[PDB]
Amino acid sequence: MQIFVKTLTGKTITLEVEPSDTIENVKAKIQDKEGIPPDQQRLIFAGKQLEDGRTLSDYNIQKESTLHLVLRLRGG
Amino acid sequence: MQIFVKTLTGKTITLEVEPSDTIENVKAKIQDKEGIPPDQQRLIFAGKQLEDGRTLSDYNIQKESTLHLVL
Amino acid sequence: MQIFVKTLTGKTITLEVEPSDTIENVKAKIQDKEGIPPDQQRLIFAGKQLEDGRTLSDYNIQKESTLHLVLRL
Amino acid sequence: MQIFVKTLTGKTITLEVEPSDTIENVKAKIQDKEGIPPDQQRLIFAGKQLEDGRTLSDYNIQKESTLHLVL
Amino acid sequence: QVCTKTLAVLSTSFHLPSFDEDDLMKILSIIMLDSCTTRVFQQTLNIIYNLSKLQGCMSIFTKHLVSLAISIMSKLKSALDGLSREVGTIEINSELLQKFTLPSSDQAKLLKILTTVDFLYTHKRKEEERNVKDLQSLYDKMNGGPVWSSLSECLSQFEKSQAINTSATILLPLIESLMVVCRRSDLSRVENLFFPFTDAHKKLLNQMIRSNPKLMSGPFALLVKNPKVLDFDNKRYFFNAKLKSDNQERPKLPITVRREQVFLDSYRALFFKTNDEIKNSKLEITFKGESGVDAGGVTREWYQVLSRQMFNPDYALFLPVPSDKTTFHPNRTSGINPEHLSFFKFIGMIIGKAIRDQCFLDCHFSREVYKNILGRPVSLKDMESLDPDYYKSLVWILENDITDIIEETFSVETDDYGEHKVINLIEGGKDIIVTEANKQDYVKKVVEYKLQTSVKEQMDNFLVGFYALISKDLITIFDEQELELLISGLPDIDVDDWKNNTTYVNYTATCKEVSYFWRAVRSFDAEERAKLLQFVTGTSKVPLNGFKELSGVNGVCKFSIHRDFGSSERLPSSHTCFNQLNLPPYESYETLRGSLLLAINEGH
Amino acid sequence: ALKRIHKELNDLARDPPAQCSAGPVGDDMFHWQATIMGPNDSPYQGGVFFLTIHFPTDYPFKPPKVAFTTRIYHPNINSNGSICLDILRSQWSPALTISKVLLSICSLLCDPNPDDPLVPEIARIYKTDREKYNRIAREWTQKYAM
Amino acid sequence: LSETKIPKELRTDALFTLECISLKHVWCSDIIRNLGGNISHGLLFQILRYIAKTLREATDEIDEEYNVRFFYLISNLADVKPLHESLFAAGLIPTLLEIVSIRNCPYKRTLASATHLLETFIDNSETTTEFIENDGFTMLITSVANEIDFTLAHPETWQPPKYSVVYYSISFRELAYIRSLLKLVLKLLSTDSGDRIRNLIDSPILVSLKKILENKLVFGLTLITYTLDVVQKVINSEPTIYPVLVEAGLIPYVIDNFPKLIGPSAELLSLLPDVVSAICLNPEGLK
User: Fold this and answer.
1) How many domains does chain F contain in total?
2) Which domains does chain A have, with CATH numbers?
3) Could you check whether the bond before residue D37 is cis, i.e. omega within 30 degrees of 0?
4) How far apart are CA G258 and CA G60, in angstroms?
5) List of chain B residues whose C-beta atoms are within 8 Å of the C-beta of residue E275
6) E299 touches chain D (CB under 8 A)
7) How far is the C-alpha of F88 from the C-alpha of F80, rounded, in Å?
8) Secondary structure of chain A in the HEC alphabet?
9) Do D19 and E291 touch (CB under 8 A)?
10) I need a surface site. Which of C28, C48, E3, E410 has the fewest CB within 10 A?
11) Domain that holds residue F28
């Protein structure tokens, strides 16, 4: 199916994902469009942070779902 | 809040600090508790050395944070 | 398109370039019209220097836009 | 980036440097490529001798710059 | 001076000489001499101060000084009266002009006397805090009120009369004297006269400062106590001098940052240094993989790109104010990233350095940020900038009517990244219903939460980061408008980019009317260009990217010019909702320029 | 003259002679500092000599003023640095270039002009004893040029 | 100049001695201090205002030699940087503008000298801004336009010199005055950034320049040279202004009548190629 990813105030983008794929695949598919490396992208849904290991099925993701994208604030 | 400082072989010590406290104040408290001068103390958190001129909030140090002391 | 380059130590010259042209092409044309080697050339537009790797469209340089040429050692 | 270094008393070579590199680093690289220690190397560019304490950025040395060696 | 310094050292620490009132008056008479130049006056001040350390010398000094001041003011009153009368009647008579222009004029001697007494009662650095009372008593004992009133009348006459040109500077020393009698009193008697006098004569004060900025280093520094009088030019010159007063050499601090990740690279390189190090360090930037850029040039590009990246909403640090995309305010949800406090502090220090470096930033902050950094409390007036229309609704609720139309409660509903949340303005705020009996507190709580509480920690970190480079007391001398001008500067609207990224209807890029319009625009001042841009789009700030980023109510909308067939006398019209400009086809360039000037000026 | 000095410096930069180098001093393009290496098979061989060049406001229509900052031994060169060369005195033409001047100076270093010298003593010792002139030149170069 | 008791010859000799002393930079500071050139109400500016007053009220009291010598002395003093800043702060430009802005004054020598001093003084951005804020551009445009129009409209006043080969018919007082005005225009074009030069050139001045070009036989090769220099400089700086000159009919006149404008004058001949290049800056000009 298809999913939507939106920034705080920027445009919205569409990805072709399936429940089994890990968040790594979603981050990579985001990268091809914007170019942000996966290590820098922070993906959130329903106000809860996501993890690379888990997948859409783990986060009960479904069709026409909107996720929120942020750029990592590396601490050092 | 309170933070914990642990050495390679020694025990762990507790320091009561605040976000505005600078790493220099942390070293001063360490000296007061153990006597080690600040120049002989090296502080590491998350694998990153801590500079004297900065504070705890700069390095994302929070309550119960664990730091490594190397001499 | 046509752009102008003002030499702070001389006159103004005209260059026929395109937005996609890189700053290196502009430097080469400036050398052709003046003879200054590109490495000696420093270009200024709206108070900011220009990087050879970037293009005119990146710096928002349009038709009739006037750049300034200075030399630095 | 690449730089050009002609030995007036010998042959010419090419090196790789960075703007922040000091002239001492350039002389060390010259020694590595040739062998003569920096103290004996004499560096000239634009008609002025190059000082170890200085750097390429201070001297405004650019890419493909041609310097002269006296040994 | 040498002999008296040795004598005082011996006394404080064989037979010692004893001075008598006649000798003290004799040495004081040096001040009255027409030959008392700056060096002579300074040496005489040192001699008098050294003598004062001997018992009984201070009382005699004070008595003689007050007597001399009374005597000189006796003549100064009549001289000022005559000068004001002549100015009102009016070339000015040379005879009375020489009474002020000459270095032996009574005004110079009065200034010297006042400076001498101030030096006597101020070089006692450990006693000034308690000697201020007796110093003010001595100044009042000189009954200088009539002289101050006459000086005020003379300055008023100078303001009214143009036949004297800018000759008011002949009274420059006397004005200085006034400052001397007020620099020690409390300004947070003569005290009641300082503020009204400066308020009345700010024009002359600013003119004098502009002509001779060095005066700020002298008694005129007291004018900081009344920042309203100082014009932005004089204020900024003084601020630059004070901030640069620590003229210590700045060590160079070369860095290397990638253009794409300039924000994070700069954060790593600089945020992990010493505050004083960055304060006193000159930054030499070196973009990774760049070419043909000198050390100085890269700094401006680095500042520009770093400012552009910091306020990128994708970082969840700052959000663009609605209708004011150019200006941003701190983001409430910045808590998603644990390091947001440190990054806010880094933004503060970089802004402080930019102010120190005199590198203007196109970024803008809502009025709340400026007011808070200046220490002023934030109210609905700041809310106007952030939400103009919504602020209008709030004020309409508060005053324009008795509301009671909406069932809103004392709580705010928000959607944090898909998570719906409710925040109570006050305890039990969710259930309490907003009514006319509790609307006055409701609006206050709403604005306080929106502007201050919702950003408390982030704005505190931003402020502490900023103050690390600029003293809070040193920056509070400005105001909201002046502070904004300090960071961003006067807006500069480009002409080529504006022209290329424009559209026409019933007109062409080569049309005679379009050519006339662009010729007129290119012949406008920067302020005039900003005024025209505001008249066209409603705001004086060009979009971050440029004129290709022009946006309206419906989104992106480039500047458009449309022919108007109405009477040529019709003033050009505009619709800011779509950056639309309906222009009549003026036959002549001069007529078009005049009409456009009239339109843009009447817009404000 | 700026348009001429620019191209002169550009020509030197493109194909600089390995025998000599020069450039602006303090970014003052009318003030130049130049370096010369002693000609091969010469008493000055292996040395480094510094020269100061001032370009007249009417350059190239007037010769540049070139002075030897470094002490040197030569019949036509005075200790104060003044140079006695034909191209810089009477044979100057706008067609000449600073690189050509440097090459001519380098040639003169190994090819003195005793018949028309600047300091009589050096010319006289040269004429009377070539070997003594070579020895003293070598010693002076070692003392200062090295 | 205020006191009439001092003999005129003695006053002029004293002024000449002051100028000769001021030729050396060491004593320029002392001269400024004595004359009060660092204060807006000093003797220097009093003399400036008196010169303006006597010019406004025509009388035998005018001393053209004294005025020119005083302006030369002021220029010599301003040759020093700190003294230049002191004079600028004291308000020299407003007083010089007051002198220059006089209308219908027949004493063209004093006006020309004052304009030359003003042109020399205006050096940097701050001085140009001070000149503009005092209505400098409008007064300059009015002066140029009215001077040229009056010169062309009154052949009777013409009295060109004898005992020399000249290519003009005007009395050389108007010639010198107009030359000083055009020199000031060129200086403003040079020092100005470029944004504000449109407020000056894009004005009735172009009509006056076109009249000068159309009346070579009346105005002379010197004025032709200065007009062509102004055109070339304004085209070189802000080349986008080229169409404006085409609308005024100036560049078309220069192109059509290029052989006519050339004359035996070293500066004009040396300028010619620069004019051709400036014209060629635009593709239509090149064609």
Assistant:
1) 1
2) 1-76 (3.10.20.90)
3) no
4) 46
5) 53
6) no
7) 17
8) CEEEEECCCCCEEEEECCCCCEHHHHHHHHHHHHCCCCCCEEEEECCEECCCCCECCCCCCCCCCEEEEEECCCCC
9) no
10) E3
11) 1-146
